[PDB]
Design a protein around this ligand. Sequence first.
Ligand SMILES: *[C@@H]1O[C@H](CO)[C@@H](O[C@@H]2O[C@H](CO)[C@@H](O)[C@H](O)[C@H]2NC(C)=O)[C@H](O)[C@H]1NC(C)=O
Ligand SMILES: *[C@@H]1O[C@H](CO)[C@@H](O[C@@H]2O[C@H](CO)[C@@H](O)[C@H](O)[C@H]2NC(C)=O)[C@H](O)[C@H]1NC(C)=O
Ligand SMILES: *[C@@H]1O[C@H](CO)[C@@H](O)[C@H](O)[C@H]1NC(C)=O
Ligand SMILES: *[C@@H]1O[C@H](CO)[C@@H](O)[C@H](O)[C@H]1NC(C)=O
Ligand SMILES: *[C@@H]1O[C@H](CO)[C@@H](O)[C@H](O)[C@H]1NC(C)=O
Ligand SMILES: *[C@@H]1O[C@H](CO)[C@@H](O)[C@H](O)[C@H]1NC(C)=O
Lengths: 150, 330, 188, 50, 50
Amino acid sequence: YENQKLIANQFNSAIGKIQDSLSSTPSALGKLQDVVNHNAQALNTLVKQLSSKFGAISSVLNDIFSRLDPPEAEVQIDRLITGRLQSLQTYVTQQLIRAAEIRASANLAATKMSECVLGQSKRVDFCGKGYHLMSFPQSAPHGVVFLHVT
Amino acid sequence: NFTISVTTEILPVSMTKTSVDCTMYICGDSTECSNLLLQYGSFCTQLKRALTGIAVEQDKNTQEVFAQVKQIYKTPPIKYFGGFNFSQILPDPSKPSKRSPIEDLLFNKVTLLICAQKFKGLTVLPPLLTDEMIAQYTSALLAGTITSGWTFGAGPALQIPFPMQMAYRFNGIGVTQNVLYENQKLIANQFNSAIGKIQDSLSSTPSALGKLQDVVNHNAQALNTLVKQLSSKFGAISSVLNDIFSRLDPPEAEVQIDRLITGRLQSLQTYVTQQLIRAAEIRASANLAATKMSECVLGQSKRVDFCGKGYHLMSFPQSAPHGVVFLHVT
Amino acid sequence: LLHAPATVCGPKKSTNLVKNKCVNFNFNGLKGTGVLTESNKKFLPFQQFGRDIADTTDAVRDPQTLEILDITPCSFGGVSVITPGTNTSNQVAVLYQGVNCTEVPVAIHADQLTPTWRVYSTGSNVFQTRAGCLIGAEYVNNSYECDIPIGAGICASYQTSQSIIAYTMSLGAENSVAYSNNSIAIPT
Amino acid sequence: VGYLQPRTFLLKYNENGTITDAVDCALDPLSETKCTLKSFTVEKGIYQTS
Amino acid sequence: VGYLQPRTFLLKYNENGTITDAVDCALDPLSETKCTLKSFTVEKGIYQTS
Ligand SMILES: *[C@@H]1O[C@H](CO)[C@@H](O[C@@H]2O[C@H](CO)[C@@H](O)[C@H](O)[C@H]2NC(C)=O)[C@H](O)[C@H]1NC(C)=O
Ligand SMILES: *[C@@H]1O[C@H](CO)[C@@H](O[C@@H]2O[C@H](CO)[C@@H](O)[C@H](O)[C@H]2NC(C)=O)[C@H](O)[C@H]1NC(C)=O
Ligand SMILES: *[C@@H]1O[C@H](CO)[C@@H](O)[C@H](O)[C@H]1NC(C)=O
Ligand SMILES: *[C@@H]1O[C@H](CO)[C@@H](O)[C@H](O)[C@H]1NC(C)=O
Ligand SMILES: *[C@@H]1O[C@H](CO)[C@@H](O)[C@H](O)[C@H]1NC(C)=O
Ligand SMILES: *[C@@H]1O[C@H](CO)[C@@H](O)[C@H](O)[C@H]1NC(C)=O
């Protein structure tokens, strides 16, 4: 109450410089960028693995039957099916690992929405570097971004 | 009446990095198998990328726990902190390696022909932060929590006498200041004797450090199972690739060796997919240590049964091989 | 097939014997690639082909004489490239992980090291660290903040006729709080 | 009178479909790092090589 | 004079390549534990033999 004008102006100037910091360089949003690049690269290696021979004569399915007879094409096509079936199990397993990483961070954001936003957390170095005052949640693509006032 | 007790808790922070070679494992000491493995696709690049991501995070866990202070502090030449004996935890300059008295016990209790059997491209990379600068990070947390208190975790570090900082740890529990100043004599003797009882407790048995030993035991026996997968034949007529090509024609070895390659590639995919499970548990424990080292030692915690069994006063970290060890006073 | 010493055997021809040099061997039908040192294990008279835990032969008996040798693979290690950005400079530093460079700095021969850019061994001065020596950087000793990690507390940078350097990691600026027993600082 | 050899070459295509730039893996460790990241610009960092 | 049976044994070799010790596998449950753990000094605890 004895320094209301200085407090209000210093918070007002602090929010001015936060626009430039998120746009100064491309490494500010690297945490959310790593989410979308991990999924886009995982899909690309799955589609590109369709063209691998896996020890068979060719990676095209129709040309095996159109040139090679049906008496022994079963062992020729089992070498290609087992390779493609293994590639799906590799993809579906790595999504299960990554979902546990997000769930350990979707519960940290669900927690920080409760102490930092709806009160003051007395846990030191949890809602900011110093003595915590408040917080403001802001949405983001596939994530959330907090603005701790400290 | 009251008693002051000292309890310890042991946590892992990181494990050993590993690098695996695409071809010296599968088609080692041969060149004709290198052409056959090329047409299988990108299994080999995915293994390298996953293992490099695991090996980067081992140096992020250590920097997250220990390296949360910017300026390295140091204790004054005098060592009279109001009547307490801190010589058991502060480093001794007389040793060639600047490490403390208790930290010398922790190194000998944990034990790390380990590479002559690893001609198959199985290599352990060294950590970025060696055991010297790790021992200098944890000698700066103790030099600021003694002189400055808890104020160096929130900006500027402010000096305070230790006989007066203890009167602020009691005030955060519920008892007033006068319980310490009127009884400064016997409280000091309980603190020194409790630390000396820790020294004999660690050297009493080797089962106290089982949480850190299982970190290196699980990794060391995981590699020994991998080097004996080569003895498995997987239905081939031999387990060595220089006997298949030297005894039968090329049109028949294309199906004999394909059974070996798709089996040895499966045995390597099972190994990496178990390391992702172990890395997700260490990170779930590195974040628990980073929480305690940011809350229990940089301040006083009001969570029941989190820091110590009872009302909590402070904590003292110690550096251990592939882990951290706390000394929660109660 | 081969479990015992052979007695029949096909034609072929015999060609000398070399030691401590990476060659190709066909000792009685066993092919491979490695060096042949001198061993000290005592074979039983009915045992010739030694083995190990990984079911790979590593001890053989020269068919012609009665010498006992050992088979160990040739050198092999990783390669990393320490570079600044493309639009900053173009010089690099090849790191040879996990090797003691007393024999690999020779490098140049009639097609020995498999990479083609082996000219760096005759280039800048080498420097040995705990993770294998790097070729293409010089070791200053004053401290700097870490810019690119290498291993065992060595971090390189791009110092600015400018070449990259390697130094020792600096954890931060040393501070010393003037502790006493009657001193309190309150912020204002 | 030149002479050709088997090599791996990275080629960059433009919008119309004409080759505008190329590089090879087996000349320079900088070129190898360019040739293993699928880019003509590499950011400042350590990179694994064959 | 004695008669042989089809069994399984665990053999330990010294540094000279000579069989200095061996353990049966179907004699008593301790031999079964040593047989299924591929060792000789089993620790205190419950185990899970065949
Ligand atoms: C409160 O408890 C302490 C801890 O036992 C007592 O201190 C002991 O007192 C006895 C006799 O007074 C001494 O023989 C011991 O050596 C003391 N312990 C230590 C560590 O010095 C203290 O006396 C108790 N206070 C009351 C009022 O009972
Ligand atoms: C705090 O206690 C330790 C307990 O070891 C003291 O170390 C002893 O110091 C005396 C005199 O300096 C020596 O005679 C002993 O040999 C030391 N103990 C050991 C195990 O070597 C230390 O001096 C005390 N410090 C203070 C400031 O009181
Ligand atoms: C590339 O860009 C900046 C400015 O264009 C240049 O100064 C610098 O050398 C490079 N920056 C990097 C590699 O981060
Ligand atoms: C490397 O080898 C040389 C001689 O072969 C030896 O003198 C030197 O000590 C070795 N390097 C290390 C780090 O031991
Ligand atoms: C650092 O290296 C220079 C040049 O070799 C030398 O003059 C100086 O004494 C060295 N300093 C230390 C601390 O080693
Ligand atoms: C403070 O310390 C000085 C020297 O360390 C000593 O002479 C003095 O008696 C101490 N005073 C108190 C009150 O502890």
